[PDB]
Design a binder for this molecule. Structure first.
Ligand SMILES: *[C@@](O)(c1nc2c(F)cccc2s1)[C@H](C[C@@H]1CCNC1=O)NC(=O)[C@@H]1[C@@H]2[C@H](CN1C(=O)[C@@H](NC(=O)C(F)(F)F)C(C)(C)C)C2(C)C
Ligand SMILES: *[C@@](O)(c1nc2c(F)cccc2s1)[C@H](C[C@@H]1CCNC1=O)NC(=O)[C@@H]1[C@@H]2[C@H](CN1C(=O)[C@@H](NC(=O)C(F)(F)F)C(C)(C)C)C2(C)C
Lengths: 306, 306
């Protein structure tokens, strides 16, 4: 029983984490085959950061300027280049622990696991969601830069995120592993705020299905509603529109519980309108939106990896 | 920036997980050197579990009935003995990936990471607490038995929990790695109940301190209180009493915030009596008691491992 925010096992990724130093700046890098990936601002000092000229700072630099350490092993850089906001360092050793991997760009609402790192060493793991405003609600200190987010499919590690920065609200921003930002953010120290964040309705519904599977059923009402009427209400409350795709993704959970997605949609309509009256669902007193429908299925089926 | 329930990186433990089969009952095993630890009810069929005589059941068993899989590769069991409610299967191959490890019995209120496994394969990692009544609020499906809970100190893995059973409430119960239950439970299928569960006061205070460090300060008072006044409130709400040891344990957080423990107790007093009034704290609408003071120090100072 029970229902937790669960991260993927981190071992496959742990074996890929290294430390990259340029001058007096050190941050985390990701070592796959004979390439190390890190944030490009590794070449910046804390005063370059108001508005760097990366092309210019970079051209100055030579292979020998970049120190790569993997545990105790010093890695010899034999090449460097900049793709968007990431630096790729070609090294003389392929990482023997390199797992099957791919790089993906996740969409708003999708979850993944973060392995928070300081000085190339793993400190912690937790699950997050890409928020609709393209930020994440992570946990990161100074030196976290270059920590990575990922999903695991059996044996294939899909890397979706590398960490770059924290925004005034205390939420976070970063890139894909091709160094393109999620959202309209830039890698410089200047005024930038995320837009308004919305709640991810498809995930809330998934969460409500989890509750039902775990015996928490008090919020089921005898109404139903249409998708159009549902969405009119959800716009009112800063909830994301629900699509037909969302509906069909909820199917497994719908078929499991005997509860039509439009029925659950109606339970949710009432909760937004009248609130939760101090009552909890699965121990939470707020509606949770950082579990996808696949997340609920895996934790309510036993999906494993190796 | 940010406060999340963070788990320890799981790689060291992942390499120790095997699959243990006896009859057609399969569950999780922990392979350290040339010993594999699992729950002793691996030797039980369905009929046995209402009231097994483990001694008698085990006598009918022999090494030959014990099939240990380690990924794709079968392991030869050359020995066996029952230690309390756990089974020690001597195998022929020491585990090459054995980390430095110790076995510890944790106390109520202490947190640890769980690597949830099915069929000997990692599924997920998450953080929880030993509750005052010696249950945990985990996430476990059929086949989760023998999954383990752990802490990492630098390079040392301290194994503190092995999972055995779910209780009426949907809370879980298990043993240490020498097979002695946390709490009054037994490994048999009969109606058992945990005690009343209290809130871990020292952890709530640690979380409030995390709240202040992350800039969420609205619940601060200027009032104070003694330990005695506070305690005589606390027990009204089923908060565990707060001892001087707890005060001294909270002293790092106090010194970092500049807020005396007894002041913070005063803040918690008002919160217990006045409720939150629809206010959140670190984005929660309830008081969180599953972060120790050390946890708070770790994630607000960024301690690493491996
Ligand atoms: C990160 O780890 C990095 N730290 C350094 C560094 F010290 C020197 C050179 C390069 C880098 S990358 C760090 C992670 C931060 C620390 C606090 N919590 C985090 O998540 N990222 C940054 O310091 C980041 C880099 C410059 C300024 N950064 C910021 O996060 C700033 N925010 C903004 O400018 C805002 F996004 F607009 F709000 C800051 C310092 C928090 C105000 C750059 C963006 C390249
Ligand atoms: C666990 O994984 C094990 N499963 C088996 C099995 F199928 C055959 C033999 C041995 C074991 S151990 C499982 C974990 C449970 C399943 C559901 N959620 C979990 O956490 N543990 C049990 O099934 C466990 C074993 C017998 C009965 N168990 C219970 O958890 C039962 N509870 C109680 O008896 C009660 F707590 F008192 F209510 C049950 C089946 C959920 C009612 C034993 C303790 C030996």
């Amino acid at each position: 029983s029970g229902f937790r925010k669960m991260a993927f096992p981190s071992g496959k990724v742990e074996g890929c984490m290294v430390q990259v130093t340029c001058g007096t700046t050190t941050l985390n890098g990701l070592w796959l085959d004979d390439v190390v990936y890190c944030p490009r601002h590794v070449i910046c000092t804390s005063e370059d950061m108001l508005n760097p000229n990366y092309e210019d700072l970079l051209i100055r630099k030579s292979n020998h300027n970049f120190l790569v350490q993997a545990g105790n092993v010093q890695l010899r850089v034999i090449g460097h280049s900049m793709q968007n906001c990431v630096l790729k360092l070609k090294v003389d050793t392929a990482n023997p622990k390199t797992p099957k991997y791919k790089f993906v760009r996740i969409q708003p609402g999708q979850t993944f696991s973060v392995l928070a790192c300081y000085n190339g060493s793993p400190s912690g793991v937790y699950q997050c969601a890409m928020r609709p405003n393209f930020t994440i609600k992570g946990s990161f200190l100074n030196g976290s830069c270059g920590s990575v987010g990922f999903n695991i499919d059996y044996d294939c590690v899909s890397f979706c995120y590398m960490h770059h920065m924290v925004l005034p609200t205390g939420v976070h921003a970063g890139t894909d592993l091709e160094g393109n930002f999620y959202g309209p953010f830039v890698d410089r120290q200047t005024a930038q705020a995320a837009g308004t964040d919305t709640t991810i309705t498809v995930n809330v519904l998934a969460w409500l299905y989890a509750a039902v599977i775990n015996g928490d059923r008090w919020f089921l009402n005898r109404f139903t509603t249409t998708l159009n009427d549902f969405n009119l209400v959800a716009m009112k409350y800063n909830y994301e529109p629900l699509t037909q795709d969302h509906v069909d993704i909820l199917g497994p959970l719908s078929a499991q519980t005997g509860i039509a997605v439009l029925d659950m949609c109606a339970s949710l309509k009432e909760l937004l309108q009248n609130g939760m009256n101090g009552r909890t669902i699965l121990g939470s007193a707020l509606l949770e939106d950082e579990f996808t429908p696949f997340d609920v299925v895996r934790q309510c089926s036993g999906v494993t990896f190796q």
